[PDB]
Write a protein that binds this ligand. Structure first.
Ligand SMILES: [Zn+2]
Ligand SMILES: [Zn+2]
Lengths: 295, 290
């Protein structure tokens, strides 16, 4: 028949990565339903419990047509398949406790052994709140909250600077260009609204984006930020940092500052401030670099 | 040095398809940023107005790195490029009106009349993921078809029929506790259609019908097989909406245990309570299509 072993992958992370080995020990070949094998796509293939209580699946549920031939993975006599899958992104395992995980065996043409592990848990009151979607793992969840604390820091620093007007202010000149009291006031308003969203608004971070760039938002759908590959490749603080990407993305929301993405990068942002302060005050990266204030 | 030429593409649908031809009239080549060309990714590249009144941008805004060599497109002296883009998915052009479209006052304005998508489900229906005007109207039609079969299904479930053929086919053998579960599940599917803020998303390019995230109501992501599916009938657009809504933990919390009618019937025969928690089983009860 079908032989399965589920094991926990060791690592210095809060991630719950499991390893499955499926072997055909039988006399004949066997076909296994492909979307019932744990890969990178979303499927509720695990039974997860916290202190004996079931933990709800969060991934996508999909309407598909009845499985045809094409949908089945072949396992020949003696052949084995080995695949890894992360569990904390599909099931909410952020709260601390003793968790149990079994793999739902794929249909052919019943469960694996259980593994049990301690989750130290995301130690944070926000989980003014922070929510997650698009398979953010336990580690991504923590890294995000760490990034948000830093975003709050530079965001506060920005507001603090904008409190007292300074016509010859270098920092301001750099990212917003030629001074006027009205233009200064616009940047100040913008930044206390960003700060307020960081500290007092229901935030949603999404880890589903697999695009090369940093992040994206739908400006009329507060407050959901989609995190892409360059956000993870980004440093926590500094230029084009994780903290700064958060300032950038939040500024877009119409209930925050309603900024556009007229241009990208410090150079373009600087040119915009000299070229058209009005454009600069309405550009997300200009607000990011103002806050990041990295030499 | 750059001549921006905008034109409307002729088509049978209420899709708003435009051609942008950019011609380098100068003597030197000019560098174009790829993201500044209307394409596949979302950027607010059009100034759109409805009979002179402004229209809202609906797309995504994206933090990209400073442009590298890969990000630029050289347009040599005398040469041109032509790009095509759909506008109604990116801007709210649902309301009736003559609309003006201008690539950004960089291009010439074009004018076109939109008949408009049925409003006043605007309980509501919102859109995301570049749903075009045609798609929006096809969706609202499908939803009204979903209301009818859900209403019909909820009317049938009001009075217990222990030998009821339709019930037996999809939910299996009768008990009053099992029947009540089905009635409850359909009362809440009906409620979603009638009284809840619905969102339909058109970005899914996968071969299947649809997906949802059970704890993110009430957002239904529509895929290729929805658009290939008939409005009503077996595995229809109406029944897909029924299937998807049922998944939400706040509606019915159904799983996807088996797909298709034979698999849905088989589940009903042997494991009625699991049938009473399978999305397709609810869909087929509603579609009720031999
Ligand atoms: Zn489903
Ligand atoms: Zn942006």
């Amino acid at each position: 028949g079908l032989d399965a072993q589920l094991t926990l992958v060791d690592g210095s992370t809060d991630d719950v990565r499991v390893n499955l080995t499926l072997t055909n020990t039988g006399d004949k070949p066997i076909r296994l339903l492909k979307w019932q094998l744990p890969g990178s796509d979303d499927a509720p293939l695990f039974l997860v419990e916290r202190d004996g209580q079931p933990v709800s699946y969060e991934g996508a549920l999909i309407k598909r047509a009845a499985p045809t031939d094409k949908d089945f993975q072949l396992l020949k006599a003696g052949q084995s398949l080995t695949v890894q899958a992360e569990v904390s992104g599909l099931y909410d395992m952020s709260a601390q406790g003793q968790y149990s995980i079994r793999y739902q065996l794929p249909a052919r043409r019943s469960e694996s052994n259980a593994i049990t592990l301690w989750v130290e848990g995301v130690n944070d009151e926000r989980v003014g709140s922070v929510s997650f979607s698009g398979r953010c793992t336990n580690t991504q969840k923590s890294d995000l909250l760490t990034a948000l604390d830093a975003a709050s820091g530079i965001s506060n620093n920005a507001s603090s600077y904008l409190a007292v007007d300074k016509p010859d202010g270098q920092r301001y000149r750099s990212w917003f260009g030629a001074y006027s009291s009205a233009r200064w006031d616009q940047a100040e308003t913008n930044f206390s609204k960003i700060k307020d969203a960081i500290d007092n608004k229901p935030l949603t971070f999404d880890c589903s984006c697999k695009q090369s760039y940093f992040a994206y938002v739908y400006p009329d759908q507060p407050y959901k930020v989609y995190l892409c590959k360059s956000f993870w490749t980004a440093p926590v603080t500094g230029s084009d940092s994780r903290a700064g990407t958060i300032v950038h993305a939040l500024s877009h929301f119409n209930v925050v500052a309603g900024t556009d993405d007229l241009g990208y990068g410090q150079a373009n942002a600087r040119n915009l401030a000299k070229t058209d302060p009005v454009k600069a005050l309405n550009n997300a990266d200009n607000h990011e670099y103002f806050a990041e204030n990295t030499p």
